[PDB]
Amino acid sequence: ALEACPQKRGVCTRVYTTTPKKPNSALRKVCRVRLTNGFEVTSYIGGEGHNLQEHSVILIRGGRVKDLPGVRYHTVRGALDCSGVKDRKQARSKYGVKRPK
Amino acid sequence: MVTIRLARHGAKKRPFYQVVVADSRNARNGRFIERVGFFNPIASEKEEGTRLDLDRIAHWVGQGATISDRVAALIKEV
Amino acid sequence: KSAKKRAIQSEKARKHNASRRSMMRTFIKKVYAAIEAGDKAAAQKAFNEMQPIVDRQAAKGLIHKNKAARHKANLTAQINKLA
Amino acid sequence: RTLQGRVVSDKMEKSIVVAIERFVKHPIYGKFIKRTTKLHVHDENNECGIGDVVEIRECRPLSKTKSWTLVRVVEKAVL
RNA sequence: UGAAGAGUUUGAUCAUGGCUCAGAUUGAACGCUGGCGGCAGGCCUAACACAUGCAAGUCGAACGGUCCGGAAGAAGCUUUCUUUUGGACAGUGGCGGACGGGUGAGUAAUGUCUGGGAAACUGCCUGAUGGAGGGGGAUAACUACUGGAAACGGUAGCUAAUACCGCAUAACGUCGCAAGACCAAAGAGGUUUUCUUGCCAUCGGAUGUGCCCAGAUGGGAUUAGCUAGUAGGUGGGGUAACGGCUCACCUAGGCGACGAUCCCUAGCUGGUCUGAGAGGAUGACCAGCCACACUGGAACUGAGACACGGUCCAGACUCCUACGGGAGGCAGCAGUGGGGAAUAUUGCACAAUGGGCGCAAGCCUGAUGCAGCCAUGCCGCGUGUAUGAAGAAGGCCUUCGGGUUGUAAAGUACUUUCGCGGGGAGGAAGGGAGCGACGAGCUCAUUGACGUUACCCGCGAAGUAGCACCGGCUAACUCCGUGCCAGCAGCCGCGGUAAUACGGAGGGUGCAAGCGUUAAUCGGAAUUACUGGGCGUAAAGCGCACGCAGGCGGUUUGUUAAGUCAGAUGUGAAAUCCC
């Protein structure tokens, strides 16, 4: 986070998929982000589905993904272009999802 | 110019003044030279509304110390 | 009031003290010159016209106390010497 | 103030440098540490020579570096 | 009166060792949710660019004209006009902007901190002494004329003071020698022969400062030799004053491993947080000091600013413009745009307190006192109270016998936050007038933001709750769905058809308008160990010798007594902390 900041905005460079390590197997969704800090790191995209393109531009929280070595940050859904998970009836605090009527 | 005025310890609904001698430059509630007494507008905390300690101010007065209009009233009441 | 008045007075103020010191260094040198030459009479007489003038500059904010006394001492110190 | 030191140099005229030494405890450890200082004391009589352990007192600044003057000589010589 | 540790490197054990955890705090932000009140608190991110308004005047007891107001005249009335008078503006003249307010960029240095020294200075105010005789001179306003689009400007004529200047006395003071000579100063107002305000010179008081000195003040030597005014001397110049501070001449030194020089960084402190202590971190609110207002530099005038709404020069930018030429500079208050995860009313008001000027009346005062916005924090309060089945319905479980959610809801009775009506606050005396000599003193009268709010009385309806978590550490369980797929995850791990660790539901635990999340600070670490540690094999004696500095040093006696120890005294600001 550089300036020891809780969060840090940035613009996605590419939204590709990655495969877990030896014990796990899947297509985890990640994305290279060029934070304002001046660093280009990879962040994980929580949720069952997202809408992050090339010029996504999202805020970074910070969290390592055990399965994906290198991914030390998590994207904050519900902020900027990163739309909150759809139909999230559960932990809406995370994934940034407004409580349905 | 040394002056004898009232320092406001004054708190919410607790207004108390401290007739003190201090340089006119210093703030109203700053470092004072010496306390000569106290004043209680409501005189509720204690029956002794004010304690002038005449002899004390009697010294500062003549030393070049001037008393404000309000303080002069209290001091005059001795 | 007029903030410019204070500006013009200050300028013309220096022009005043500037001339006063001129008279000082002019005669002080004259006295010293006379003393150096050996002319006692003319020298001292010229020395006197330098004393009150430097004393007068002290009267106002021209030369002030100290610096005024300095000049008197230095002048009389240079005249009684070369003489 | 009076200070005791040694005459480590009598090269200059009417001026002698006295090397005063003191012992102070370290602010952290506390163990005694050695510290010295050179002071240009006045000596109009050029009475003090090198090796003389003299006393030094504060006096009217003779010069910019000299603000001390020789008071009395403790011992005769120690090179 | 003050110190609990635990989890994980093994097949198991012990040791070494690193990582990690429950607590408290934050001028925070984010997610879901959200009723009231009191106090407190709010760009912690760009000196990025800025629309608009606002950020010091006051005197007619210093003098001549306009604007606003009153009164009395010449007149039958009107027009017009005359005298007197109040306020104020415009001008002339006097005294004040270097205080207060903002910010921290820059800054390692007697800059600051602590304790001293002296080569010094100080308006108004206060005490004491003495004095105030005679005379002379000058510039605007105003009037007339001309130039310019404007700003504003040129010329001619008149004129005043507590404005300037020359002469007297010497209380004294200055200079040479020793025990001589030189040098000063404006009135005005009145209850006007008496006071009031003010002036000149000198001494002192009060207070505030300039300068110097001892000690103390971060990181790196992959920063080591450095220096010519550079070190010192004589003389001179310069300043309020010491000083190479500057100059001439002479000498040749001065500094360094107790680290100079260079480079990097950050306003400093009282204090704040933490800790058993030592110590570590920090210095944001408030208080002291320091340094900065378009960018850079500079000086003038002054007790003081080298001075935000003063001036001069260089530079960029913005606006105005008949382009000839001008006007500015929100890192001042509020606010706008841009930035960011994020931080507010371009509000009310001076009566109270305080400040500037004035004899006073009085004038000025977004300093401040308040309200507004935001659960940002802290404390207080409410969403109800009592009753109510061996025990409804519904959901859930079942050996379907039954059990569970439950007195929990329904329902009965009671009180009754909001809301409505009435009352309605503390926070504040004089000017003036009467008595007294409109003096001292005494007496009497008139007048308030937040509020019609707080609070009191009366009436009076039951009247929002949510969020996180339940494998272990961590207190709190089942069913279903899914199925190493989807996903979870601080660490150990979990999921390949029976999962308390995934999703839902019932239930349960915690807390409560709050609840979680993210980021940051503290010890445990006796893992730099002074108190508290080690080096034959776990990390660790330099290969040896010689030797400089430095550190350390045998027995007896005497002097000093610097270290050390003891008594007294001064200092150690306030606040804070503790009782």
Curated annotation (Swiss-Prot), chain A:
For biological process, the GO terms are:
cytoplasmic translation; Group I intron splicing; maintenance of translational fidelity; positive regulation of RNA splicing; response to antibiotic; RNA folding; translation
Upon changing K21R, the result is: Confers streptomycin resistance but not hyperaccurate translation
Which residues does this entry mark as bearing 3-methylthioaspartic acid? Answer: D67
This protein's record includes keyword Cell membrane:
no
Which molecular function term from Gene Ontology is one that the record holds? tRNA binding
Annotated keywords: Acetylation, Antibiotic resistance, Methylation, Ribonucleoprotein, Ribosomal protein, RNA-binding, rRNA-binding, tRNA-binding
Post-translational modification N6-acetyllysine, affected residues:
K86
Report the family membership: Belongs to the universal ribosomal protein uS12 family.
Q: How does it assemble?
A: Part of the 30S ribosomal subunit. Contacts proteins S8 and S17. Interacts with ArfA. May interact with IF1 in the 30S initiation complex.
Which named protein is this? Small ribosomal subunit protein uS12
Curated annotation (Swiss-Prot), chain B:
Q: Which top-rank group of organisms is this from?
A: Bacteria
Q: Which residues form a coiled coil?
A: none
Subunit (UniProt) = Part of the 30S ribosomal subunit.
Keyword annotations for this protein? Endonuclease, Hydrolase, Nuclease, Ribonucleoprotein, Ribosomal protein
The record's listing under InterPro entries reads: Ribosomal_bS16 (IPR000307), Ribosomal_bS16_CS (IPR020592), Ribosomal_bS16_dom_sf (IPR023803)
Natural source organism: Escherichia coli (strain K12)
Tell me its family.
Answer: Belongs to the bacterial ribosomal protein bS16 family.
Stored NCBIfam families: S16
Name a single GO cellular component: small ribosomal subunit
Q: What does this protein do?
A: In addition to being a ribosomal protein, S16 also has a cation-dependent endonuclease activity.
Annotated membrane-spanning segments are: none
Pfam families given in the database record: Ribosomal_S16 (PF00886)
The record, for HAMAP family, names:
Ribosomal_bS16
Gene Ontology molecular functions: DNA endonuclease activity; four-way junction DNA binding; structural constituent of ribosome
| Induction of its expression | Part of the rpsP-rimM-trmD-rplS operon.
Output one GO BP term.
Answer: ribosomal small subunit assembly
Q: What is this protein called?
A: Small ribosomal subunit protein bS16
From Swiss-Prot, chain C:
Q: SUPFAM superfamilies recorded for this chain? A: Ribosomal protein S20
On assembly, the entry states:
Part of the 30S ribosomal subunit.
Pfam family example for this protein?
Ribosomal_S20p
Give the encoding gene's name.
Answer: rpsT
Disordered: region residues: 1-22
Name used for this protein in its record: Small ribosomal subunit protein bS20
Keyword list, A-Z: Ribonucleoprotein, Ribosomal protein, RNA-binding, rRNA-binding
Q: Name one GO molecular function term.
A: structural constituent of ribosome
Give GO BP annotations, semicolon-separated. cytoplasmic translation; ribosomal small subunit assembly
Top-rank lineage group of the source organism: Bacteria
Family to which the UniProt record says this protein belongs: Belongs to the bacterial ribosomal protein bS20 family.
List the record's Gene Ontology CC terms alphabetically: cytoplasm; cytosol; cytosolic small ribosomal subunit; small ribosomal subunit
Keyword Ubl conjugation present in the record's keywords: the answer is no
Briefly state the protein's biological role.
Binds directly to 16S ribosomal RNA.
From Swiss-Prot, chain D:
User: What is an example of a GO molecular function annotated in this UniProt entry?
Assistant: small ribosomal subunit rRNA binding
Q: Which family does it belong to?
A: Belongs to the universal ribosomal protein uS17 family.
Domain of life, per UniProt, equals Bacteria
Key words of the record? Antibiotic resistance, Ribonucleoprotein, Ribosomal protein, RNA-binding, rRNA-binding
Query: Gene name, please?
Result: rpsQ
- Additional info? The strain missing both S17 and L29 grows very slowly and has a rather unstable temperature-sensitive phenotype.
Q: Does the keyword RNA-binding apply?
A: yes
What is the name attached to this protein's record? Answer: Small ribosomal subunit protein uS17
Mention one GO biological process in which this protein takes part, according to its record. response to antibiotic
Self-association and partners? Part of the 30S ribosomal subunit.
What SUPFAM superfamilies does the record tag this protein with? Answer: Nucleic acid-binding proteins
Gene3D superfamilies reported for this sequence: Nucleic acid-binding proteins (2.40.50.140)
Q: What does this protein do?
A: One of the primary rRNA binding proteins, it binds specifically to the 5'-end of 16S ribosomal RNA. Also plays a role in translational accuracy; neamine-resistant ribosomes show reduced neamine-induced misreading in vitro.
Q: Name one GO cellular component term.
A: cytosolic small ribosomal subunit
Q: Explain what the record says happens when changing H26P.
A: In neamine-resistant mutant nea301
